[model samples]
Target: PLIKLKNFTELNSQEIELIFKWKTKYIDFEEHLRFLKKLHQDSSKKYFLVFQDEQIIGVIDFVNITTKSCEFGLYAKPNLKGVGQILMNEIIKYAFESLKVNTLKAYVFKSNHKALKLYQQNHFTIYDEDKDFYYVYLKQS
Candidate 1:
């Protein structure tokens, strides 16, 4: 659903619109842009957007890399119509090829069943659980 590109300056109208929707959760546009700018400055951030017809449909990120293993959060958004799986697959490819990591891991909220299933379907298996979250890992492609 996305094409990995540069900063929000590269985003088209719809992509900007999508981020505008997501920005409602934060302080304001300037604050949001600050965080996004930081992502642009860091290569290991693994920040990416999901696009459909050049419109951003989802976004996700990666963080905390060590050797062949890394934590993903790095943020993701999907259209919520079973499009997350597709995003996850693209993420896997990015993880394996771009990130050059052997293991991909994530910490998902306990209530986030959609994320749980998506990770599982993508080969990320559960390794532990806590009151607030589940830990899972996937092998690199």
Candidate 2:
């Protein structure tokens, strides 16, 4: 199935339930719901729900956006191999081409090896790290 991204508005109950089913180690559901509501209220932040032929496969966002840079984050459906790459590729294109941002950044938890590997695979370089997270970035080519 081809992956597509849709602008996030409000989530229906089923979608919210699907998101709750995602097995990420981090992220509290209540806090995430509050965060989503806050982002929706803001005009500058971009948030999207990833789909594969009508099936919700992931969620992605670009926050803290400026003229030249933005912070990125995503959560993909667990056990779906390679879905992350597709989502990242699309989001990166959107950032550089649509958003006209020159750089994209992400802070991945130290324990999220899968996410770190996906970022590295997509050519994001680790520029900094603290005890809990790695600071990574990708510049537009």
Candidate 3:
């Protein structure tokens, strides 16, 4: 139910805005362009897009990497039907088998139940939390 791509410029203005607005900051378009460019330039980072019927629906990115470990974050179009979980499964498979990373880390804002639930369902255990976020991790067997 998802497709993957490596380039952020393939994402349109609306797709970029949708990503940043919901996932991170509601920054201006120029900043979003710069972020996309940096993602393109950064070799340690890999950005993957999820599409259904040729429409951009979600993005998952892994950064701060070593073969042993890395961190990932994901966001999807609000109200997507099972798309978020499917995207997570795909990315996790790539991480373990293709990237060979033993651990995948993530942090979810404390207030975002949707994201927290998704992570937990996928076996990301919360190891820490503060006022702002939950720090979670998934380790490969």
Candidate 4:
């Protein structure tokens, strides 16, 4: 595998700082820290840090899981070519095979064209969109 996924709880302070350092404008370090704390308390959510060559490069998560489907999100370190596709592939495999979810869903910001492209490349179809986001999903096949 080109990358590895480890439980989010395994994240260290340096890796947490790195994630915030690479964060988008939509979130800040303090807010992200708070969000992580909240996520930590939720049993239904599963979050992972993406590692490459022993370094944290990205984060991926499954939220709102149910018998039939779940929603997910991910972000890679800034300006790392092709990392998004690798992360997406691994997450999809986990949700479909390990979790046995019938479908996987995502809500990508309308402004995040790179993420939209990544999902499309992985065969996720846009089912709807609003002013702020594009709702997408891929069914198990």
Candidate 5:
């Protein structure tokens, strides 16, 4: 199967359902709907999905976007290896090349060892942390 990318606006029902299914495992359905709605409601925020054989298997979302910087959020299908780094690479390219951002930031829950490792491996470094989350960042000039 080939991996593909799409902006959130181009997502279809099946793709939304797949992402929702993944989301509900962590958050309630209504809350997830609200989250989706917020993404839809915003014009400046950018969201993209990673697909494998047409199924929505990953996401790269940005908020608080500006020419100089943006906040990043991402996901890969559960238990699916390798795809997260691939998604991150593509998203980073978009942020730096297409969006012309200098810095990217992400917050990961303190207990999310998986995400922490992923970010660290991809050149993000922790600049701060609270009891609950680590604030990590990367910058390209």
Candidate 6:
């Protein structure tokens, strides 16, 4: 149901540029490497970049994490059929198994239907929603 996996740390400079091109769909990239470097340097927030075929396709950010839980955000190249799912599954499993975080969460816009579906399919449940926001969680058994 997903694609191949990669270690973000292994990407080269040119690979990072792919992120810039997709920034609008890939929000954090427009902020540029300066910002990404800042995000990477932020010990409090565990932000990750995802790559496919040696190019950056998305990011999986682990934010506000504590010993028991963490939150996250995702970005995928717009119009790409199924890239996000692969990245999401990778992060979710890692969070649940290796990260040892019993709980994972996120808040996404209602307008992002595709993302909503992906989250739901991955077992994230919407426990709180209002206006344009949804607060969700995926717990590891």
Identify the candidate with maximal lDDT. 4
Model 1, runs deviating above 4 Å:
1-9, 12-17, 23-27, 74-80
**TM-scores across all candidates?**
0.77, 0.81, 0.78, 0.83, 0.81, 0.75
Alpha-carbon runs more than 4 Å astray in model 3: 9-27
Instruction: Please give, for residues 1-141, the per-residue lDDT of candidate 6 as tens digits.
Output: 234444444445566676555623345555555665665566556656665765556777787878789888887766566788778877887788767899998999989888888899888899999998988998886
Question: In terms of TM-score, how similar is model 4 to the real structure?
Answer: 0.83
Clashing pairs in 1: 1-50, 1-51, 2-51, 58-77, 59-76, 59-77, 60-75, 61-74, 61-75, 62-74
On TM-score, the stronger of 3 and 4 is 4
Error of 4 at 26 (Å): 21
lDDT of 4 by residue, 31-139 (tens): 7678778877886799998888877677889999998899998988787777887788789989998889999999988999988988998899999999889999999
Flag regions of model 4 displaced more than 4 Å: 23-37
Candidate 6: misplaced stretches above 4 Å? 1-12, 23-31, 52-56
Candidate 2 lDDT by residue in tens digits, 39-141? 7788679888888888877888888889899998887788777688878887898899988999999999989998899899889999999989999999986
Q: Where is the poorest 10-residue window by lDDT in model 1? A: 1-10
Checking candidate 4 for backbone clashes, the offending pairs are: none
- Per-candidate Cα lDDT values, in order, are 0.68, 0.83, 0.80, 0.84, 0.82, 0.73
Deviation of model 2 at 106, angstroms: 0.5
The best candidate in terms of TM-score: 4
Instruction: Tell me how candidate 5 scores on lDDT.
Output: 0.82
Report the candidate with higher TM-score, 3 versus 5: 5
Ranking by lDDT: 4, 2, 5, 3, 6, 1
**Clashing pairs counted in every model:** 10, 0, 0, 0, 0, 1
What CA RMSD would candidate 5 show? 3.6
Q: What lDDT score is found at residue 61 in candidate 1?
A: 67
